[PDB]
Amino acid sequence: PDDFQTVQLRDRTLCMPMCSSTQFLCGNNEKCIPIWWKCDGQKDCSDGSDESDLCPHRFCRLGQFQCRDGNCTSPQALCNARQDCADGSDEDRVLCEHHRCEANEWQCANKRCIPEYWQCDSVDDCLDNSDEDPSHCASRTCRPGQFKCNNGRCIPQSWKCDVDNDCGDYSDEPIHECMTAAYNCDNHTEFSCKTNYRCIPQWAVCNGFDDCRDNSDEQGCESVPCHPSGDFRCGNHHCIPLRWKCDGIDDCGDNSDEESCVPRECTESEFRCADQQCIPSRWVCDQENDCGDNSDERDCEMKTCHPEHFQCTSGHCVPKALAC
């Protein structure tokens, strides 16, 4: 393939990856991997060629780089032109000769390589103007629907003219422009703040959140009427439907509802079971355990299943159609 190189030793034809001096190649010439991976202790190659007996012992963390003395240094240091490893394996002339920089990196006229994104970020990462040169940095027209500001940043268009300093340099807050008629608010779907030039969706006006950073939107809402029936009240002065009082959810926000869960006392028209469940008195003796604990039917006399029924040794009555 064109991602490989072609050589013939005598008559046979061989194909080999075109990888650089900072990479290592494996058995069968199947794949090439960064040199630090060679002896890191993890079999990276498709075969055992990665860490054969030629690799010396390993003395540091996975993915790092090792030096011929017996010391390790991080891998991006390999050819930064400064000996981060005193052994001199770092900046080894053999490795830096025919140097090539990985895809996560960009290279400049200074024979230096910097992370690809660092380009045009106001810092001369190449140690010279090459990575910040306005000639190549200019004309970086970002995507449509976005806005571009003096900080050299691109931001959503909607984020313009809100007190959130999103561009960092306050460039997205042209106060004089923001207070112009074009920025004015749609009273039918939006809301405006008492001390700010900001507009928020009308539903947001009251939700328990300071949608206006001056807290001016929510100020109006206060109603929480504690209806006397079908409702329950909480220590923090909040009211919730009575059914919510004991359901395993802390609806009050202070657990005032759930902590008082004592089985409801049965009325004079009811009967009580082992789980203190309450059932109509008629259920106490009908030959069915309306309470799964058999509170009913255990005390009752051993009466018999009237006609059109079948009986079970458990003291149960079942329609004959069900019998077989």
């Binding site: 991976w37 890191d40 963390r61 891998p75 991006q76 810092v123 691109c154 340099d169």
Partner: protein, 129 residues
């Protein structure tokens, strides 16, 4: 009992797939719930175009140095070719900057915001819905 959808217990009894680590001894021999089966997965080895982290984690090569901690253990951003002083005062990051001990910075957005997909120095808003 096919092994991926169903499970067989040491008692030569079969249990459904979800039961295998539901926390119940669905089969009385207690083979189900055994640590041998339930223990956490073996993370895949980092492939070409990726990077390795002390954390037993793999990060895409592009992410390896972008002022954001992608390895989780900061193993990605640590040790990049410094070049000029990467001081927070540059105000490169939109919302938050943290200066590293050895120089350089890592950036985070405020809650409800995540670093933008096309520019990790900028921030975009999480669609919590």
């Amino acid at each position: 009992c096919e092994s991926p959808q169903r499970f067989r217990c040491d008692n030569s009894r079969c249990i459904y797939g979800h039961q295998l680590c539901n926390g119940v001894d669905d089969c009385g021999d207690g083979s189900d719930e055994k640590e041998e089966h339930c223990r956490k997965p073996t993370h895949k080895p980092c492939t070409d175009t990726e990077y390795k982290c002390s954390n037993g984690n793999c990060v895409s090569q592009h992410y390896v140095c972008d002022n954001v901690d992608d390895c989780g253990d900061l193993s990605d951003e640590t040790g990049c070719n410094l070049g000029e002083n990467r001081t927070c005062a540059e105000k490169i990051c939109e919302q938050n900057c943290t200066q590293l001990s050895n120089g350089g910075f890592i950036c985070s957005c405020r809650p409800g915001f995540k670093p933008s997909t096309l520019d990790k120095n900028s921030c975009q808003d999480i669609n919590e819905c």
